[PDB]
Amino acid sequence: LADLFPGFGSEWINTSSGRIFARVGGDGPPLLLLHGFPQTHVMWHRVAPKLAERFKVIVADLPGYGWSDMPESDEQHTPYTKRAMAKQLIEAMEQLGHVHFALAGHDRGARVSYRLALDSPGRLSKLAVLDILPTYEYWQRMNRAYALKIYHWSFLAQPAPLPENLLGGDPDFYVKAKLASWTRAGDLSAFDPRAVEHYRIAFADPMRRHVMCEDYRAGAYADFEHDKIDVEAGNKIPVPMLALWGASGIAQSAATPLDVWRKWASDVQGAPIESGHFLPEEAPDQTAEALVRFFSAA
Amino acid sequence: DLADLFPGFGSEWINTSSGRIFARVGGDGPPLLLLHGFPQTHVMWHRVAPKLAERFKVIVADLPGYGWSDMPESDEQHTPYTKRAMAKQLIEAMEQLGHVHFALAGHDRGARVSYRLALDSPGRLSKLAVLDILPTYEYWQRMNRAYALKIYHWSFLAQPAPLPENLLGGDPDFYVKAKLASWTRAGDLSAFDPRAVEHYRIAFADPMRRHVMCEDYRAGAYADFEHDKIDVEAGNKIPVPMLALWGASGIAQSAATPLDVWRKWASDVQGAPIESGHFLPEEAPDQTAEALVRFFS
């Protein structure tokens, strides 16, 4: 596998729930980046160098993803709920001495991010989410048109081992299908071919695939229940927040993103990016520019 | 290798302008057509068909593209596997037997063909019975988190080719067996005759047959929904006397009250729950046969 982060170090951060792998580089105030599905930390490889000029950038594999350890799930899918993932990543940042940091997440990592901001707002200086709406909002808007578009939210959440058996017949096909279908061009041209190999090799492991299904099972149940408690109680994110989305991405097909996040965050600014779902790879220059200005602002 | 579960029944290859329709024919009296659904074939009626053949001429047909019936070539709109097209093709088949006015009972996908047939050509039916379904328009209109998780296969199988086709090939024996067991009351295959389970499994092993099933659900997500929509907006109802049966732990009542919903679609409908899961004629064959025999006679 290619090293897509030249100059960055490599670290294995031990937590009570398992080791967190991360690439480390830059200097300045600490900034944590989190990837999504079906990717790994290498999805940031074209914006992390630009961020590395001003911040100490930590690019971590989500718990259960990439090279991080895989905790054993349970009937509640507890280790792969976003609330448990947030606590483990907080533990990892304390191992590095970072108890107050900035955080940017994409796809599943952005879900860990806003849950982290709700459960423990004192840990974040600023927060940025990429091309998502809250899990609660995806499910409340689950009509016919949206069920067809994000079918995998319902399919991957089916009980074990039905989705795992189906994905095992040709796993290369499914990861390449999901990567291509969410870009604007509809193919794999926006991705560095060395980064695709990282995604393909990670998806080839059946234990990694089961972990991703546990992630989506938590997103259909416990993650939804946690978000439901927060909306019906009127709990908003008090951390200053940036919401970026692709003009052809997933979040915009559901609603108007800034209007929804205003209901969830007291201090939120937003902007679209001419791209599909994978902002830092389809539009690296504009995403990095939007992130640098926001985090270095006040 | 396949057991014959219809002793005393003939076997007919009925020609239509879109392909042959296979059917087991038995009994005597007025004609009655029985249509199966997903993921089964005609043999699902094998425990209730002999009792109906005591009073009717019973035609147990494979749906177009299903089981041993021919597979018409599909197109961009999945035209031949829309319920309107399937209904027209089956009207053709019955005309080949000289049946222009008959009784009809459908289950699952065949029940969707049935009520679409009653909406398009009501003069062709004397009575109509649907098993454990609501109209396709009602499933999509009620789509929420709970229903999207339960009938996930409506959105999954409706994805563009070849995504469901390739994933179904990853383990087809497991999938067809997981659908049969998870929709029963017992949660396993213990309610099915093992020889019937074979019929379903060897049919699901043909990749061309699995493609037809995805085309069925692709039509169910689009064209079938559009046709139900025109009837709903126009206030069109089913004028044929109708029987609606559903399972106490079936698909239809988990997200509605079935007889309440069907009254908005039909001007004369009676209903009854059955102590069963989804597969009424195999999980509770005596109760299903009793209600059908009474309703049709």
Side-chain angles (χ1 to χ4, degrees):
Chain A
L1 299 183
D3 177 21
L4 297 165
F5 297 83
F8 281 61
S10 299
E11 287 240 39
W12 268 278
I13 312 158
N14 265 94
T15 76
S16 65
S17 291
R19 286 173 294 143
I20 296 298
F21 179 79
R23 300 294 296 272
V24 187
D27 50 61
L31 170 56
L32 179 65
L33 310 180
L34 300 176
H35 68 92
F37 171 90
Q39 308 196 288
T40 67
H41 73 274
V42 303
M43 63 135 282
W44 297 99
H45 71 113
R46 288 197 277 218
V47 315
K50 304 184 180 293
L51 294 165
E53 180 245 294
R54 296 145 168 255
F55 305 95
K56 184 197 159 178
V57 168
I58 303 144
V59 200
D61 278 336
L62 280 183
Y65 282 74
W67 293 348
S68 294
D69 289 344
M70 290 171 291
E72 178 158 75
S73 201
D74 51 49
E75 318 281 347
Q76 303 293 326
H77 329 290
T78 317
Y80 301 102
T81 67
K82 310 304 160 293
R83 163 169 285 149
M85 275 182 183
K87 290 172 187 169
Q88 186 179 356
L89 284 169
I90 286 162
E91 253 196 62
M93 293 297 277
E94 275 199 4
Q95 290 294 313
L96 298 183
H98 310 314
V99 298
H100 193 78
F101 53 93
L103 172 60
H106 179 245
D107 191 90
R108 312 308 287 181
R111 312 200 172 272
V112 172
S113 300
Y114 84 82
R115 173 50 55 194
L116 199 162
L118 282 166
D119 289 352
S120 311
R123 298 278 183 168
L124 302 179
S125 54
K126 299 216 216 197
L127 160 66
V129 295
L130 273 68
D131 201 45
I132 71 144
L133 308 177
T135 290
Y136 174 83
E137 304 286 353
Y138 272 40
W139 285 114
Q140 284 294 116
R141 296 161 166 79
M142 188 66 61
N143 55 23
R144 160 180 173 275
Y146 208 40
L148 292 172
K149 186 120 48 166
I150 55 158
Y151 82 98
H152 65 294
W153 275 53
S154 286
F155 164 66
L156 293 173
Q158 295 305 298
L162 181 123
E164 285 97 328
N165 288 352
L166 290 196
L167 297 173
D170 193 358
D172 273 18
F173 166 80
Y174 195 76
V175 69
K176 287 188 297 203
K178 282 296 156 289
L179 287 166
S181 69
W182 296 338
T183 68
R184 196 179 39 167
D187 57 10
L188 290 170
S189 47
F191 305 105
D192 188 305
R194 300 167 292 162
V196 176
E197 272 316 291
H198 274 269
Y199 313 144
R200 200 191 63 78
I201 291 303
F203 204 87
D205 190 324
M207 289 308 106
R208 301 292 178 181
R209 289 200 300 277
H210 172 58
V211 156
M212 300 171 192
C213 291
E214 287 300 297
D215 188 351
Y216 273 84
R217 290 179 185 111
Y221 292 101
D223 296 339
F224 171 77
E225 299 291 336
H226 298 164
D227 282 6
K228 176 179 181 297
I229 291 192
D230 276 317
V231 278
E232 300 178 339
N235 300 337
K236 288 189 173 189
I237 299 176
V239 176
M241 178 180 188
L242 171 74
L244 292 171
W245 69 91
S248 309
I250 299 186
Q252 55 86 21
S253 74
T256 302
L258 199 51
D259 285 355
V260 175
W261 278 117
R262 254 88 154 259
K263 192 172 71 92
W264 286 81
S266 57
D267 179 13
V268 52
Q269 57 184 288
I273 295 235
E274 192 41 56
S275 147
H277 184 65
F278 304 97
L279 270 54
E281 302 170 281
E282 293 181 61
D285 284 330
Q286 312 95 301
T287 294
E289 184 79 19
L291 288 170
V292 162
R293 295 225 209 175
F294 178 71
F295 287 120
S296 57
Chain B
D1 47 327
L2 291 191
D4 159 44
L5 306 169
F6 293 85
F9 282 61
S11 315
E12 291 246 40
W13 291 101
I14 311 166
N15 304 279
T16 77
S17 66
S18 305
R20 296 171 306 164
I21 294 302
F22 175 80
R24 309 295 310 273
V25 179
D28 172 78
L32 163 66
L33 173 58
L34 305 178
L35 301 183
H36 64 87
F38 176 89
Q40 309 191 278
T41 67
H42 74 275
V43 308
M44 55 141 290
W45 297 101
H46 78 104
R47 290 206 250 176
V48 313
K51 311 215 179 166
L52 285 170
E54 292 171 10
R55 304 240 214 150
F56 305 90
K57 179 195 172 172
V58 174
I59 304 152
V60 202
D62 280 345
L63 284 186
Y66 276 82
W68 294 338
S69 289
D70 280 336
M71 298 179 287
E73 198 176 358
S74 198
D75 54 45
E76 298 73 29
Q77 269 200 89
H78 331 285
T79 304
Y81 301 114
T82 62
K83 307 304 158 288
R84 168 160 294 154
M86 288 182 177
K88 284 180 195 161
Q89 182 180 357
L90 285 163
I91 289 179
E92 273 202 41
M94 297 289 273
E95 281 198 2
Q96 288 288 309
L97 296 176
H99 305 313
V100 298
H101 190 229
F102 52 88
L104 176 56
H107 174 256
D108 192 74
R109 316 304 294 183
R112 310 199 176 278
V113 174
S114 295
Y115 83 86
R116 172 49 52 198
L117 203 159
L119 280 172
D120 286 354
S121 316
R124 296 266 170 172
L125 303 175
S126 39
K127 283 175 170 248
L128 162 75
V130 298
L131 273 72
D132 207 42
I133 65 137
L134 311 182
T136 286
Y137 173 90
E138 298 294 334
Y139 279 21
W140 290 115
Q141 278 298 112
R142 286 166 174 77
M143 194 55 56
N144 56 7
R145 165 170 167 270
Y147 213 43
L149 285 159
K150 193 174 73 100
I151 54 155
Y152 84 99
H153 61 292
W154 278 47
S155 293
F156 163 65
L157 301 176
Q159 290 309 295
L163 181 120
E165 282 90 348
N166 291 345
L167 279 172
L168 287 180
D171 206 331
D173 269 21
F174 166 83
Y175 192 75
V176 58
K177 279 181 187 169
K179 288 285 155 271
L180 300 181
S182 60
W183 297 347
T184 52
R185 179 60 185 106
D188 56 17
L189 295 174
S190 63
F192 300 100
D193 188 305
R195 299 162 300 171
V197 163
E198 288 299 320
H199 281 259
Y200 312 142
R201 193 199 56 78
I202 295 95
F204 205 81
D206 191 319
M208 306 191 81
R209 296 293 177 174
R210 296 196 302 269
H211 175 56
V212 168
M213 306 178 179
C214 292
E215 293 292 293
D216 185 355
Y217 280 83
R218 289 179 186 122
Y222 297 104
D224 296 348
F225 173 80
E226 299 291 342
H227 295 163
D228 287 17
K229 192 146 168 37
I230 268 68
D231 288 309
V232 153
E233 293 168 344
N236 295 345
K237 294 206 185 180
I238 294 183
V240 177
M242 190 180 182
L243 174 67
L245 305 176
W246 67 92
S249 34
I251 296 173
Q253 72 84 49
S254 271
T257 37
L259 191 66
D260 266 354
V261 164
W262 275 113
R263 284 207 213 274
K264 328 257 182 298
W265 286 81
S267 59
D268 166 54
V269 48
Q270 43 188 293
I274 306 282
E275 292 146 40
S276 166
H278 184 54
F279 305 96
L280 261 55
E282 297 162 289
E283 296 183 68
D286 301 317
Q287 302 84 340
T288 296
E290 172 89 359
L292 294 181
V293 159
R294 163 84 300 280
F295 177 68
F296 282 117
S297 64

